[PDB]
Amino acid sequence: GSSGSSGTLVRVKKSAATLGIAIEGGANTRQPLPRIVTIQRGGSAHNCGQLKVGHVILEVNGLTLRGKEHREAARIIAEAFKTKDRDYIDFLVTEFNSGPSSG
């Protein structure tokens, strides 16, 4: 399996004391991958700025969130924060072009 052309790997360092990110969707729901609906201020992601509100996590630290439920994902991401081996979390987003008419 190739590296992955569709998508942009985003590295978020655990700068903040606690990661604060919100998502929605899930396999069950029309949306297969989780989409960022809210990005807490005191969260590594935000502090980074690289990421924005409205992204879609397709892969985290190598683990793909395909066919996974938002809940199952929340755990995957969190687990990446607990560990110490790495001082960051990989966030693969595509920034789908939802309703280009306006945005």
XYZ file of C-alpha atoms in Angstrom:
103
model
C 0.000 0.000 0.000
C 1.394 3.347 -1.124
C 2.033 6.131 1.388
C -1.137 8.002 0.479
C -1.476 10.815 -2.048
C -4.971 11.895 -1.006
C -4.446 13.668 2.304
C -1.946 15.773 4.235
C -0.178 14.263 7.245
C -0.281 16.749 10.123
C 2.106 16.401 13.062
C 0.792 17.904 16.301
C 3.257 18.147 19.187
C 1.945 17.608 22.717
C 2.688 21.227 23.621
C -0.524 21.637 25.617
C -1.018 19.891 28.959
C -4.106 18.180 27.545
C -5.325 17.546 23.998
C -8.685 19.149 23.271
C -10.388 18.123 20.038
C -13.971 17.312 19.057
C -15.270 15.251 16.137
C -18.428 13.606 14.800
C -19.723 11.031 12.337
C -18.483 7.464 12.096
C -18.881 4.384 9.913
C -22.498 3.921 10.998
C -23.173 7.529 10.002
C -23.051 8.566 6.346
C -19.615 9.965 7.186
C -17.039 7.142 7.380
C -14.202 9.195 8.864
C -14.516 11.593 11.831
C -14.720 15.312 11.063
C -13.442 18.033 13.391
C -16.448 20.050 14.559
C -14.831 21.931 17.441
C -11.210 22.655 18.351
C -10.635 23.501 22.013
C -8.385 26.501 22.646
C -6.110 24.827 25.176
C -5.439 21.952 22.807
C -2.222 20.929 21.070
C -4.049 21.053 17.737
C -5.122 24.675 18.192
C -1.815 25.839 19.670
C -0.353 24.414 16.460
C -2.632 26.278 14.070
C -1.717 23.918 11.241
C -5.101 22.238 11.682
C -8.476 23.959 11.338
C -12.114 23.386 12.292
C -13.746 21.235 9.630
C -11.059 18.662 8.873
C -11.488 14.891 8.597
C -9.145 12.487 10.382
C -8.607 9.478 8.118
C -5.487 8.142 9.835
C -3.884 8.686 13.243
C -0.355 7.485 13.993
C -0.709 5.013 11.140
C -4.024 3.617 12.355
C -6.712 4.379 9.774
C -10.109 5.512 11.055
C -11.820 4.024 8.001
C -15.010 2.169 8.872
C -14.409 3.201 12.476
C -16.993 4.905 14.688
C -16.298 8.403 16.011
C -16.137 6.831 19.471
C -13.582 4.203 18.454
C -11.492 7.041 17.026
C -11.613 9.229 20.135
C -9.873 6.353 21.913
C -7.268 5.846 19.187
C -6.224 9.501 19.262
C -6.185 9.703 23.059
C -4.009 6.587 23.207
C -1.500 8.399 20.997
C -1.332 11.178 23.588
C -0.843 8.948 26.630
C 2.148 7.069 25.218
C 5.554 8.679 25.736
C 7.535 7.074 22.914
C 6.402 9.941 20.687
C 5.842 13.553 21.741
C 3.243 14.209 19.042
C 0.189 12.842 17.235
C -0.151 12.184 13.504
C -3.358 13.583 12.012
C -4.144 12.664 8.406
C -6.700 15.098 6.987
C -8.023 15.797 3.491
C -9.952 19.020 4.086
C -12.819 17.835 1.884
C -14.393 20.637 -0.150
C -17.859 20.781 1.409
C -20.302 22.994 -0.465
C -17.807 25.020 -2.528
C -20.623 27.373 -3.530
C -19.764 29.578 -0.553
C -16.815 28.084 1.304
